[PDB]
Design an enzyme around this catalytic site. Structure first.
Site, PDB file in Angstrom:
ATOM      1  N   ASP A 177      -4.897   4.191   0.784  1.00  0.00           N
ATOM      2  CA  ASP A 177      -5.754   4.720   1.836  1.00  0.00           C
ATOM      3  C   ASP A 177      -5.006   4.989   3.135  1.00  0.00           C
ATOM      4  N   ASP A 178      -3.766   4.529   3.258  1.00  0.00           N
ATOM      5  CA  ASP A 178      -2.971   4.713   4.461  1.00  0.00           C
ATOM      6  C   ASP A 178      -1.744   5.553   4.135  1.00  0.00           C
TER       7      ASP A 178
END
Lengths: 333, 308, 333
Positions: A177-178
């Site tokens: 997600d990053d």
């Protein structure tokens, strides 16, 4: 919330080029034995046996280390982040996705992940992998694949005249997600997400408030690699413990503060809280061997101390005199 | 008769499953409209169909044998008969033209039916004059020949003299995914097995062989008739004069009640009773009822240039 | 209130799989003789003669001990409950059904209980058992079968991709109207009950207020197995006696307090009431042999005493000073 937003015709060629670049030189692969998968690192095992091997072979290869950061030690993560920020001269952008596994579309799932897995694995294993993907449609690698696909789409939209291999060679670090990307596509990333049907959150890098990445704050990535837990996410919620009711509060607090020491020993406004928790709940907690034999146990640079203090103050928007007053209040309690 | 039991004993079935993973991704797919607004174009629809089949074949992991596994898009003319495609006994996917209307505008290319052949005239591309091979009719099992070398032909010569043949079976499905282009369908096939069949014996399952359609109505010479099924379980009929543009869609029930009338005046009165006021509709209905034959002329046509 | 809510098509396969797993390895059975049924443990006898044997054979087998708790001694019940809570790490959910025998549908009755009985018993006894089931449609085992069916349905809905045998192997303790299940299906249980047409009441486990099971309260199931009568159900009604008018009040009160001593000797706010009843109604009651020869007679850990007191206070939401005042008032009366 399932979504069926198929992408446009033009984006399909970009996705296929990204998938081919992901394939690279690893045409053939073989599945791992059950014993090897079990000693690696029910329902998780049946997919893991293939996905762990696929990740280790393709995603951890020589030509796929530019973007697949997910899968390395935290020291390696810090080194990669510092190298990337040095390369980009502190000009980077952060991507924060909301429920990616709950928002990836059927077309994306069947044209990125399924395609990559089928191309990576041997033909004789096609049926098993396709059945596993079909079961999935109706873990970690999927998020990395989605991030890589979105990065490839952004790069293709930014420079449509360059060769796909050269475009993909510029893929920056990405981990679930990053991820990190060039700031020159800050506005065009939203349009790419809309074309695919995903929601993207982007924030310009600001040295005054630090950089957010993997819930980690880089106090001064230009010079030092010192890093701390994200203060914005944890400070507003660290006073409340989300452990299950069966565990005593003391054991959960002790495990939390032990983890914080293991990761945030010298971070201002957190070390004092951790020490006060250790002082209060510490003696009242149970035996540490007892919690080491208990299931819920795993359910949780000194030179720039001044700069880290100032970066934490900037992150938390708290005045230095107010910070000192808070530190005094916490210590004296 | 004993021929039934004889044939049943003569099974000679050899089912084959060459890891032909079912293309469930292609099957049970929600229909979609390719064009954002207005109407699509033949090139756009073809590109969308190619993209769909390509992504399906990529997901399944198999290969294909594209002809200008087996895949064909708008190649009705390029293929004289579907039997040549089916004889390989391999999965076959087609994007054909099986209209639900006798005539009118197909996608963006107008079309009409003269005799039993389709006078298809693409907006961009060569005009096509080919028949239709009865794809979407009732039934899932089809009988088709099998590729055999001339040497095998000679070998079977004594065996085929009696009337033995090698026949392949397949399973059928289509989708009709585009609402703007309902006249086009996405055929899907799955071979099953091969057996030996006696020429002079019937079959239980009423397996049919693809045949050219007979649109012309023997009872109404000079006219073409056709009828299809509707989302709401309605049986609509499309009729129009052969080799001519006009057409109309009507429920078969009303057409049935109309056909047996005696006086054209009564026909017009009944049409008025149902609230149909469009002259273009009632006049055509009367024309069909009276079976008026007109020698439609052949005139040159001026089409658009393709706007890619 | 009779109901005829047939389940959906998909649920039928789940119910059949649950029934087959209930059958296990006991394909054939034989009925019990009348004398044996009579010495085991009119209208009750005719059904009991078959149902007791069926329960003892199938429901008390090696492969059906995971869920069929109903049918064991209270010490065994406490041991099973403590083992289950230790396995689930104090993460359990409670099910409370309202008029299950008055709400089970015809389809459920004819596809769970009838199917199980017919599969368990010998073919030559099919007519008798089917007639008995038909008479029933127009006791204890039915509730357990319904609870097992609902647990199997919940497990099937939670993990539709696992094998039915492995799914059923996770069935937790169930006993009639009460049972235990994993907390991860707390929300999905309501949808399963709606699909079958049953009404379900679920409450998250809370250590502060204890755990409710079989009208028994576990003060601290994580460490100790000490258990007491349910305070919520009995305290609000213990002052009123529901015995028949023909019995003197003293005998009924004496029997009630004798049972309470037999089950709740060291429970706060109940021991004082029991002792005061024994002091007041005791001497005024009749002879105990007389009530032992009378029909209406059967119509009714010291180490953690502090913790039990606090758990009872939390259950009854009464302040400790208020609890002490109430205890003083009760004793001095």
């Amino acid at each position: 919330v399932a979504n069926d937003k198929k992408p446009s015709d033009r984006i399909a060629k970009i996705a296929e080029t990204f998938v081919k670049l992901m394939n690279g030189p690893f045409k053939d692969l073989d599945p791992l034995s059950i014993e090897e998968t079990i000693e690696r690192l029910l329902f998780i095992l049946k997919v893991s046996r293939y996905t762990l091997a696929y990740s280790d072979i393709v995603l951890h290869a020589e030509h796929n280390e530019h973007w697949y950061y997910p899968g390395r030690n935290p020291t390696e993560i810090a080194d990669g982040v510092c190298e990337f920020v040095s390369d980009c001269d502190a000009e980077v952008i952060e991507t924060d996705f909301s429920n990616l596994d709950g928002r990836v579309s059927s077309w994306m799932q069947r044209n990125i992940a399924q395609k990559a897995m089928v191309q990576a694995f041997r033909p004789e294993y096609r049926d098993e992998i396709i059945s596993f993907m079909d079961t999935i449609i109706n873990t970690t690698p999927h998020n990395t694949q989605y991030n890589g696909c979105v990065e490839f789409t952004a790069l293709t939209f930014e420079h449509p005249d360059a060769e796909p291999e050269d475009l993909f060679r510029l893929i920056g670090p990405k981990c679930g997600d990053d991820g990190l990307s060039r700031a020159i596509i800050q506005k065009s990333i939203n349009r790419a997400a809309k074309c695919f049907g995903l929601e993207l959150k982007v924030e310009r890098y600001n040295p005054e408030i630090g950089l957010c990445f993997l819930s980690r704050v880089f106090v001064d990535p230009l010079a030092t690699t010192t890093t701390i837990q994200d203060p914005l996410r944890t400070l507003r919620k660290l006073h409340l413990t989300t452990r299950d009711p069966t565990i005593p509060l003391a054991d959960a607090a002790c495990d939390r503060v032990e983890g914080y020491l293991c990761t945030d020993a010298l971070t201002p406004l957190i070390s004092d809280y951790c020490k006060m928790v250790l002082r209060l709940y510490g003696p009242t907690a149970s035996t540490e061997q007892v919690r080491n034999q208990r299931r819920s146990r795993n359910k949780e640079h000194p030179q720039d101390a001044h700069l880290m203090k100032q970066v934490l103050i900037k992150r938390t928007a708290i005045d230095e005199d107010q910070v000192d007053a808070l530190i005094g209040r916490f210590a004296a309690m | 008769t004993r021929a039934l039991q004889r044939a049943v004993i003569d099974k000679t079935k050899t089912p084959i499953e060459t890891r032909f993973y079912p293309l469930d991704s292609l099957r049970t797919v929600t229909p979609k409209r390719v064009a954002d607004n207005g109407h699509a174009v033949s090139g756009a629809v073809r590109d969308a169909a190619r993209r769909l089949i390509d992504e399906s074949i990529t997901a399944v992991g198999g290969s294909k044998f594209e002809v200008n596994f087996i895949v064909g898009v708008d190649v009705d003319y390029y293929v004289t008969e579907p039997d040549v495609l089916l004889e390989h006994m391999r999965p076959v996917v087609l994007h054909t033209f099986n209209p639900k209307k006798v005539s009118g505008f197909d996608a963006d290319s107008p079309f009409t039916i003269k005799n039993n052949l389709v006078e298809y005239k693409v907006s961009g591309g060569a005009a096509w004059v080919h028949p239709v091979w009865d794809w979407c009719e009732a039934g899932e099992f089809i009988a088709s020949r099998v590729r055999t070398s001339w040497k095998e032909w000679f070998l079977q010569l004594p065996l085929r003299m009696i009337g033995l043949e090698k026949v392949g079976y397949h399973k059928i499905h289509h989708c009709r995914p585009w609402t703007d282009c309902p006249d086009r369908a996405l055929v899907y096939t799955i071979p099953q097995y091969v057996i030996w069949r006696f020429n002079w014996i019937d079959t239980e399952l009423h397996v049919r062989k693809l045949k050219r359609i007979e649109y012309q109505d023997e009872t109404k010479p000079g006219w073409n008739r056709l009828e299809y099924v509707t989302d709401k379980n309605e049986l609509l009929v499309s009729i129009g004069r052969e080799g001519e543009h006009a057409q109309i869609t009507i429920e078969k029930e009303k057409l049935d009640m109309l056909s047996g009338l005696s006086a054209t005046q009564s026909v017009n009165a009944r049409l008025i009773g149902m609230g149909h006021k469009d002259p273009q509709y009632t006049s055509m209905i009367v024309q069909y009822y009276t079976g008026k034959k007109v020698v439609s002329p052949i005139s040159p046509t001026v089409y658009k240039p393709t706007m890619p």
